Every structure is written in C-alpha cells, then in structure tokens.
Design a protein around this nucleic acid. Structure first.
Ligand code: ZN
Lengths: 56, 255, 259, 120
RNA sequence: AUUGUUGAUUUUGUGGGUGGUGGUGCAU
C-alpha cells in the first residue's frame, strides 16, 4: 500500500508552478492524466498495460 | 465384451491424444500471436480513430441519488403462526429435556461416557472493566441501587457488533460481574436490605444473560473461585468462609 | 477498415477463441478493451463463435477495464445476445455454466448490468424461462441496496408482464433496506391493480407470481408503510386476492405497524 | 442565500449528472485534462503540499479554474455525497473529502449564476 | 475499502434467511 501516491507525481515550486515528474500514456483511450509507472527497464501503463522504453 | 471394452478404451485414448494434440497446437499459435503482438499493436495505434445519454439512462441516474437522499427502511421476516411458535417451542423443550436426561445418566459432551473419565483416575465514554477493582472505581461514586444501571450500560456500550474484540471484553466482564455479585454480599447491607435486594438480584439477572453467551469465561472464573476458596479454607478454616461463599454456590445452581 | 496485417492477426485470434477452454488467452485479445475501436476489433474476433469459456474470461476482462458507459455496450451487444441465444438454442432451454458465471461478473458493475442486461431484456419480449434464469443470478450475487432499489422502482413502473413480475419478486426477496420512496412505488404498483376510473390492470387476470411478489412485500415491508397505504393494499386484497395466498397477505399486512 | 448554501445545491445538482470528481486523485486528473469547471478545496488540510498542488493546478495559465475555500473537509464530503443517511435523516458515517472538482453542472440554476457572478 | 491502473463495485467483525437453471407424476 502507498499513501498519497498522487502527491509524489507532481512537484510544486515556491511560485506555485506545477511540474509533472512522470510521463503520460500516449494511448488516446488512456488520454491525459494516465501516468506510466516508472520501472527500471520500462514504463508501464496501469490502464492499457502497454509497455514503453524509458528513453523513448 | 472384452473386445468391446478394448475398443472403448482404445477410442477413449484415441480421443485423449487428439485433445492433447489440439491443446498442443493451441499453445503454439498463442506463442506465435504473442511474438507478433508488438508488430500488430503498433499498426492499431497508428489507425486508432479520433475522439447524449438516453432518457431512460438519465432517469436511472436521477433515481440513484434521490434514493440516496431518502431514508432507508428496516427489513422484517415472516411472523410464524402461534401454532408454529408453540410447536417450535415445544420441540426445543423436548430436545433440551432429553439432553438433560442423557447427561443425568452419564452422557458427557467432550458424546463420551462417565466410565471414560474413570480411566487412570485412581492410579494417579463507558469503560469496560477487565478486573473487579476497575469496576469498583467506575461504580465507586454511585449509589448501591445504581449498580444495575452502570453494569447494563457497559454491556450496551460494548456489544459484539459495535467493534472487533467486544466478545472478549464482554467475556471478561462476565467474570468480573460475578466477582462483583459475590463482593457485594460480603459487604454489610443490613442498613438498606431493600436496596441491596433490588441490586443483588438485578445483577444476577444480568449475569444470567451474559452466561448464555459467555459461559466459557464464566466457567473459568467459577473454577478459579473454587480453588481460591479451597486455599483460604486450608489456612483460616471457617473464618475464610463468608456470606458471599454461600451466595456463590447459589448462583452456580442458577447458571 | 483495420490494417490488413491486423485483421489477419485478430482473425487468427478468433480461431483460437472458438475452441479455447483453458490456459492463457492471446495477448492481443487481452488488450482489446484499451483500444478505442474495440467494437470493430471485437467484431473481427467473431463473438458469436466465442466458446463459453471465452465469454467468461472476456466478461472479466472488459467489465474491469472499460468505463461504465462502454461496459454497458459490451454487456448489451455481446453478453445479452449470447445469453438469449444459448437459452433459445439449447434443447432443454438451459444456460451454459460458463455463461452463467459471465452474467455474475457483469453484475460486479451494477449500473452497466441493469441498464445493459436487465432493462433491455424485460423491454424486449423476455420470456418466463429467461427471467427465471436471470432472476437466479440476481438472487445469488450481492447487489447494492441503492442500485437494486433504483432497478425495483424501474420495473414497477413498466407495463405488467409475468416476466417483469419475476424480477420484481426477486428484488423483494433479497430483503434490501428499500428507501421509503421505493416502498411508496411498491404500494403504487400493487395499488394500480385494484378496481375502481382505472385501466385494464384492474381487470387483468393475475398469475400466482404476482401474488407471491405481493406476499413478499407484505412479509418484509409491512412495518414501513403508512396506515393509509395499508388500507389501500387491503382494499386490493379483497378485490384481487388469491384463494390461498390472499388470507396470508391479509394476516401479514394487519400485523404491521404504521411508520 | 449564502455562498455556502449556494454550493450545497450546486454540488448536489452536479452529482445527479455524475459531474463531480471526488478525491485528490480524481481532482488532479480532472484539472490536468481540462475537464474542471470549478474547484472546492479545504482549508484544514493537514499537509500543505495538497493545498499547493491544487492551487498551482487551478491557477495554471492555460486553464484558469475558479477555486473556493471550505473550512472543514467533513462538510465538503457531505456535499460530495460520500456520507449516508439515518432513520433520523441526519448524515452518518460521513467521509472527509479534501478536494472536490466539478466537471458538469448538469442543470442551470440561479445559484450557479450567483457563484459565477461572485468570481467575476 | 478495494479492483486490475480503479473508485466505494469491495474488505473486516458480529448476527442471519435461505434446500432450487431439482427432479418426478397428477389434474385444461
Ligand atoms: Zn496505453
């Protein structure tokens, strides 16, 4: 179990700007807001189960 | 017959290998499809298409929330007829008396017999008080006639359904309650015999209801008292004995 | 049309699904719900040739992944049609064991199931055997009280048909904490069957299933109706009461207290 | 009609059309997709990072979304519909909601005009 | 809470009704 996992995805600077620390899934059905889990060798989508390379 | 059997066994084996062969080819293509998965999925993603509720669907969603706003009714079961209730009650009475007769004649519920036991015997907000003293502190400032009120509330405040572990707490409270019933009898009550009579029997009635559900905890405490009282008798003899000891034996007969 | 390379791939998948019975499903099949045009992709996999085993695994896959709106179309277009076809085509008019589990898994998403399986079925000439089989699935699996009450309010307002009565009886038998708005609707549904100006429902002959449903409501929700409502229901019994069930309904209604 | 009373009906109307995102995760997802029309946030959130995140997202230049301040999460959860109702009718077993985002108003009400007018 | 990312559909504790895609004959 992970608590406040959503908080970890985003970083807020002192001026209130919001920056995304994780990449979003390119599948249109996933659309925006669907974040790829960062594994050592791949990026994994929890919704589509698609796999992307980390440096692609 | 034997020839017919050998044909049947041969056919069954013949079909079994065919099914196994069918399963064998089944995994082969699935492996091939998995290998070709990445090539296939890519073209699908290249050709993915670009981006009103039915009135019935609108109504159903509207119903869901309005039902949420509504209060919820409690359910009820069928009322058994008076003849059925009497028949069921009579059946339960008949079963219980029969078990009592069997236990009287030596039936022991581990369904063993007394003779079995005779082998080798001769050869060799509201706080739930886990201890008797705790209950006194909670009821320290209350009058004698208020003890049933506080004792009943503790049971209500810690019913099994309210939270996990309440069965254990109530189980111990059954043991604690018994010591309280014996404890009060020791204390002088000639001043307010009427008040003591209203509290002592009331607490016993509460203990009976608890004993129906938590006889095991009560049974352990009851045996402990017998050993403790025996130990006191070894030293003080009759001085150890008190009014509560007479009361205690009386309660055991009830429960 | 899909890419000609894909259609061959998913054409091959459909062949596997026709005779699949166990093991792991094809990887291409498992990713269909993610695709936007899953209706087109599912079409080439030829669903009405899906084996009963595939329908069960398919139902698990699509109900969990698709949205509520999309899961509705899967239930309505595939699971419902397959459910009807199997009953119609089977010699004994029974439902295959794997399809029977598929309906249960669809029920995991109550909103999609009711508006995709139940309401379309009763509104599209459901027969008694179809209702009984579906009613058992609804009877055994747990449904939320809120969603179940909404469905019960829905069925009560529909035109009377013995198939619809069965679903009405099943929901009542479940012993839900029906909201008082639903209870009022239950009274109105039975109230409209009493003779007075009124429609044919007053004079329409009543099967036993209606009486059994009316008995169940009396047995379970007698303590949750107003005294005026109790009088109306009693008015219904004297007019339309059954020979044997009617006396028991009268006993149960009278034994209840007003809310 | 106070602003708080206005939001009570507005949020309920959003619920009837399935137009509310309840929770931090759904609120963040709604904002980044541009599906957010209004943001309701709680002042008594223990972790200031939650306040900073929603404030930054709600104040993004591309999609400026109005933001509202709520004293207690528990009452916001009650407006979100999380809690259930008793035999008495009072809300029971209510769940605190830190953030609520409205995706669809569902129906036009005078109370929707007032809250928009207050922001303008 | 939980599903396989998802959103209250579940999980936990205490109670608890149910024989039911049951058969087989009978009476339009
Ligand atoms: Zn994807």
């Amino acid at each position: 179990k992970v608590k406040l996992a959503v908080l970890s995805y985003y970083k807020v600077d002192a001026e209130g700007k919001v920056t995304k620390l994780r990449r979003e899934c390119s599948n249109p059905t996933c659309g925006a807001g669907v974040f790829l889990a960062n594994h050592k060798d791949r990026l994994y989508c929890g919704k589509c189960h698609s796999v992307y390379k980390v440096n692609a | 017959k034997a020839e017919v059997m050998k044909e049947v066994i041969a056919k069954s084996k013949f079909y079994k290998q065919e099914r196994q062969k069918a399963q064998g080819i089944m995994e082969d293509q699935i492996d091939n499809l998995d290998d070709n998965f990445e090539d296939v999925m890519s073209e699908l993603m290249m050709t993915q298409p670009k981006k009103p509720k039915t009135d019935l669907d609108k109504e159903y969603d509207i119903k869901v929330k309005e039902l949420q706003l509504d209060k919820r009714a409690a359910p009820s079961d069928r009322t058994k007829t008076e003849e059925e209730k009497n028949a069921e009650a009579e059946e339960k009475k008949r079963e219980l008396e029969q078990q009592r007769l069997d236990r009287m004649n030596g039936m022991i519920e581990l369904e063993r017999g007394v003779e079995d036991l005779d082998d080798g015997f001769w050869e060799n907000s509201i706080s739930c008080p886990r201890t008797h003293d705790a209950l006194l502190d909670q009821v320290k400032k209350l009058d004698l006639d208020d003890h049933p009120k506080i004792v009943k509330n503790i049971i209500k405040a810690y019913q099994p359904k309210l939270a996990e572990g309440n069965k254990e707490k109530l189980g111990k409270f059954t043991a604690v309650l018994l010591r309280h019933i014996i404890f009060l009898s020791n204390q002088n009550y000639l001043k307010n015999v009427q008040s003591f009579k209203r509290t002592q029997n009331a607490l016993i009635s509460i203990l009976k209801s608890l004993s129906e559900k938590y006889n095991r905890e009560l049974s352990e405490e009851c045996r402990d008292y017998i050993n403790e009282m025996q130990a006191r008798y070894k030293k003080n003899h009759f001085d150890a004995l008190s009014n509560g000891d007479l009361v205690f034996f009386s309660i055991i007969g009830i429960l | 049309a899909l890419p000609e390379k894909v259609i061959k791939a998913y054409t091959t998948v459909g062949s596997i699904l026709k005779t699949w019975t166990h093991g792991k499903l094809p990887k291409l099949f498992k990713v269909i719900p993610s695709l936007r045009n899953w209706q087109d992709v599912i079409y080439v996999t030829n669903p009405e040739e899906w084996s009963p085993h595939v329908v069960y695994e398919a139902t698990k896959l699509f109900v969990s992944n698709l949205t509520a709106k999309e899961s509705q179309k899967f239930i309505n277009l595939i699971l419902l049609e397959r459910f009807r076809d199997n009953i119609e085509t089977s010699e004994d008019h029974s439902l295959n064991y794997h399809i029977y589990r598929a309906v249960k898994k669809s029920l995991y998403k109550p909103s999609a199931f009711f508006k995709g399986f139940l309401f379309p079925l009763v509104e599209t000439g459901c027969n008694v055997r179809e209702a009984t089989i579906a009613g058992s699935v609804l009877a055994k699996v747990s449904v939320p009280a809120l969603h179940s009450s909404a469905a019960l309010s829905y069925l009560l307002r529909l035109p009377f048909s013995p198939p619809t009565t069965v679903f009405i009886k099943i929901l009542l038998d479940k012993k839900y904490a029906l909201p008082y708005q639903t209870v009022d609707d239950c009274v109105y549904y039975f109230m409209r069957f009493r003779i007075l100006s009124n429609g044919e429902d007053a004079t329409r002959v009543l099967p036993v299933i209606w009486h059994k449903a009316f008995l169940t409501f009396a047995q379970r929700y007698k303590n949750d109706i107003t005294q005026d409502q109790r009088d109306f229901l009693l008015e219904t019994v004297r007019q339309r009461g059954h020979k044997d069930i009617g006396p028991e309904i009268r006993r149960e209604l009278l034994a209840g207290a007003s809310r | 009609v106070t602003i708080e009373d206005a939001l009570k009906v507005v949020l309920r109307t959003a619920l009837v059309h399935d137009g509310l995102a309840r929770g931090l995760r759904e609120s963040t997802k709604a904002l980044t997709r541009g599906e957010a029309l209004l943001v309701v946030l709680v002042s008594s959130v223990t972790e200031a990072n939650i306040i900073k995140l929603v404030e930054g997202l709600a104040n993004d230049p591309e999609n400026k979304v109005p933001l509202i301040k709520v004293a207690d999460a528990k009452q916001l959860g009650e407006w979100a519909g999380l809690g259930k109702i008793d035999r008495e009718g009072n809300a029971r077993k209510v769940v605190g909601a830190s953030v609520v985002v409205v995706k669809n108003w569902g129906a036009e009400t005078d109370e929707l005009s007032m809250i928009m007018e207050h922001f303008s």
